[PDB]
Amino acid sequence: SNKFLGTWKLVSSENFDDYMKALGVGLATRKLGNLAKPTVIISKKGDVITIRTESGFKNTEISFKLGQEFDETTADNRKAKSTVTLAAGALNQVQKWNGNETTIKRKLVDGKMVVECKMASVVCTRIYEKV
Numbered sequence: 717s718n719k720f721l722g723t724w725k726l727v728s729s730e731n732f733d734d735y736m737k738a739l740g741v742g743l744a745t746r747k748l749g750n751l752a753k754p755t756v757i758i759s760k761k762g763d764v765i766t767i768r769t770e771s772g773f774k775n776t777e778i779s780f781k782l783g784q785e786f787d788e789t790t791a792d793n794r795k796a797k798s799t800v801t802l803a804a805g806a807l808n809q810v811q812k813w814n815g816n817e818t819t820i821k822r823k824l825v826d827g828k829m830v831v832e833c834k835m836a837s838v839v840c841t842r843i844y845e846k847v
C-alpha cells in the first residue's frame with residue numbers, strides 16, 4: 717500500500733538481541749546489529765514495492781509484488797523465501813528458511829511504523845518515525 721511509502725528512522729527497539737539469537741545469528745554479528753540505527757525507505761514503482769534498509773554496517777533491499785513468494789538473502793545471510801501481504805494498516809511478511817519461519821509485521825500508528833518480529837516464543841518490537 718502507498719500508505720507505507722516514505723523514509724522511516726529507528727527511534728526504539730525492544731528485545732532485538734534475543735530476536736537475532738533465536739534466528740541463530742552469531743555474537744559478533746549480533747554486536748553490530750545492536751549498534752545499528754537503520755533507516756527504512758519504502759518506495760513503489762507500479763505494483764512492485766521496494767523496502768531498502770540502510771545502516772553503517774549493512775544495507776539490504778528487497779523488491780516484491782504482494783502475495784507472490786520471492787527469494788531473499790537476509791542481512792545476517794540466511795537464504796530465505798518470503799511473502800508480503802497487506803491487511804488494513806499492516807504489511808505482513810513471512811520469511812522461511814530450512815524448516816524455520818519468522819514473521820515481520822509492520823503496523824502504522826499515528827506517524828510511526830511499529831514492527832513486530834516473532835521467532836518461536838521471542839517477540840521483538842522496533843519503532844520507526846516518519847521523517
Ligand SMILES: CCCCCCCCCCCC[N+](C)(C)[O-]
Nearest residue numbers: 736745748749773774790791792
Ligand atoms: C560483511 C558485513 C557483515 C556484518 C553485517 C552486520 C549486520 C547484522 C545485522 C543483523 C540483522 C538481523 N536481521 C536480518 C534479522 O535483521
